[PDB]
């Protein structure tokens, strides 16, 4: 549950999420669930041919990455939570 | 929090496949595991028509637009 | 079990750990737990087989990630 | 939903996850869905393994033959 | 007759295993547990449709994961 | 264990294998147990093929988020 | 409503399944299981004619259902 954690750190924060079928996506992080769904809302091209779409939900087992600013995270958190995490 | 597909509901939309081919219809039902319940689906490749009313497995989604 | 056991006389030993895409490592196994994932040293990359040609060499530990691994065997 | 002792002793299919066609004699089966077959033959042409288990896991399609 | 039986008794006998692709493994079964991850002994590699990959020598464990057929000999 | 060890290199550079020719190098930030991954100051090299002739690519990211389903190997450089 | 629950709701229905490896599955909903796990009788198989079969939910693509499904 550690990244649900994380990716709910990013609500309301622009981000880029590149799909395993090589479409990038850019729109700001409205939801995430516990599979790691993602809800976008003002989506952009950083990108497929789509009409008039403002509202996405990507499914969280067709991401590759999600690009983020080094500024949306604090680092330290980040390890050391993942520190405290169980395997 | 969570995000659900809810404010999707009865709602046309598209839908884009992990292989890659684009989808439109409207969307009457959905569980967690994100199988959807469509209802006037077209393929957009070719605007042909696809079903009056189809089951689409999660697995094979990527992506859910509303337009 | 013995699965399980296999996973403790084999610590230390020199295994060739196959992943899905063919990909072949050999090295002496560090760790290992139950979803397969492995820890090796002195690891060799290999395509397929053990004297094929030589892809890579790692100096320092490798991690296996399980839901890739085909095979783990000894020699 | 499958009730598998009906099939058993019979000619059935198997479509493996793979693309592994398997035709065979029912002669046992768990929840699961683990079939043993006899006089199994598989396609990917053609042969003849004997007596052999089929996962559950990797079955896709079940039929008569 | 229970499939996890059958797989028992071939316990200690010659084995071939066939993956989801046109990979198998001839060897002596020496375990296997609920999901089907095996232990095989001197295990002969094979690609199919053939090639012999490789004669291991000693204790292979092969997931389960990929696992579809159980050969008996 | 394996996990473990890799808690050990945190904030330590590392190189990880996905997929499809793909590869990563960056510092490790934080991961889990599907070896979902984030690293900062990553570079990812993709190896493609055009016209039959082996062609590599770069790409640069400060902060990234990765799925854990294509790794295949996570180590240091 | 939910996919599952229409599903079941739909038995003696005819139906059209896509697989996963594009073929194609024609007949009429015996039983559903919780994974969309399918018998159909009065089968027949396009890339073959069946009286009864069994697909895994998991390697179901999409199912084309009946117009009059309401």
Do not use: C
């Not at chain 3, 820890?39 to 839901?67: C, P, Q």
């Not at chain 4, 396609?43 to 896991?57: Q, S, W």
């Not at chain 6, 499809?20 to 960056?26: E, F, K, P, S």
């Not at chain 6, 493609?48 to 770069?58: A, D, I, P, V």
Request: no cysteine.
């Amino acid at each position: 549950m550690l990244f649900f954690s994380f990716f709910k750190t990013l609500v309301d924060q622009e981000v880029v999420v590149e799909l395993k079928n090589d479409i990038e996506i850019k729109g700001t992080l409205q939801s995430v669930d516990q599979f790691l769904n993602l809800k976008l809302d003002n989506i952009s091209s950083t990108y497929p041919h789509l009409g008039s779409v403002r509202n996405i939900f990507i499914r969280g087992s067709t991401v590759r990455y999600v690009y983020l600013n080094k500024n949306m995270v604090d680092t330290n958190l980040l390890q050391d939570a993942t520190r405290r995490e169980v395997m | 929090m969570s995000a659900t597909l809810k404010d999707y509901l009865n709602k046309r939309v598209v839908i884009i496949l992990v292989d890659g081919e684009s989808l439109i219809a409207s969307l009457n039902g959905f569980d967690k595991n994100t199988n959807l319940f469509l209802t006037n689906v077209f393929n957009r490749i070719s605007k042909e028509f696809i079903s009056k009313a189809q089951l689409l497995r999660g697995s094979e989604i990527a992506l859910v637009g509303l337009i | 079990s013995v699965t399980t056991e296999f996973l403790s006389d084999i610590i230390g030993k020199t295994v060739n750990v196959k992943l899905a895409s063919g990909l072949l490592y050999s090295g002496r196994l560090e760790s290992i737990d139950g979803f397969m994932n492995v820890a090796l040293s002195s690891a060799t990359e290999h395509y397929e087989s053990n004297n094929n040609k030589l892809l890579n060499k790692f100096n320092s530990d490798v991690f296996l990630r399980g839901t890739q691994v085909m095979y783990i065997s000894e020699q | 939903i499958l009730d598998l002792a009906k099939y058993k002793d019979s000619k059935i299919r198997v479509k493996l996850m793979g693309g592994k066609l398997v035709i065979g004699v029912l002669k046992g089966y768990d929840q699961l869905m683990n079939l043993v077959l006899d006089d199994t033959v598989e396609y990917m042409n053609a042969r003849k393994l004997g007596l052999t288990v089929i996962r559950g896991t990797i079955l896709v399609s079940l039929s008569s033959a | 007759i229970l499939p996890l039986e059958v797989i028992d008794k071939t316990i200690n006998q010659k084995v071939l295993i066939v993956l989801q692709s046109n990979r198998e493994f001839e060897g002596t079964l020496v375990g296997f547990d609920d999901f089907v991850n095996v232990i095989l002994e001197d295990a002969v590699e094979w690609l199919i449709d053939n090639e012999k990959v490789m004669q291991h020598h000693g204790r292979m464990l092969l997931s389960g994961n990929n696992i579809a057929i159980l050969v008996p000999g | 264990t394996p996990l473990d060890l890799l808690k050990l290199n945190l904030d330590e550079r590392v190189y990880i294998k996905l997929r499809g020719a793909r590869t990563l190098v960056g510092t490790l930030q934080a991961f889990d147990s599907h070896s979902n991954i984030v690293l900062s100051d990553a570079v990812e090299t993709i190896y493609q093929l055009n016209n039959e002739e082996l062609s590599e690519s770069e790409r640069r990211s400060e902060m990234v988020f990765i799925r854990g389903d294509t790794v295949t190997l996570i180590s240091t450089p | 409503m939910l996919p599952l629950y229409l599903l079941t709701n739909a038995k003696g229905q005819q139906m059209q399944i896509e697989l996963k490896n594009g073929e194609i599955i024609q007949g009429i909903l015996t039983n559903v299981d919780n994974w969309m796990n399918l018998t159909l009788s009065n089968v027949t198989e396009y890339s073959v004619k069946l009286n009864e079969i069994y697909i895994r939910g998991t390697f179901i693509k999409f199912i084309k259902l009946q117009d009059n499904i309401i």
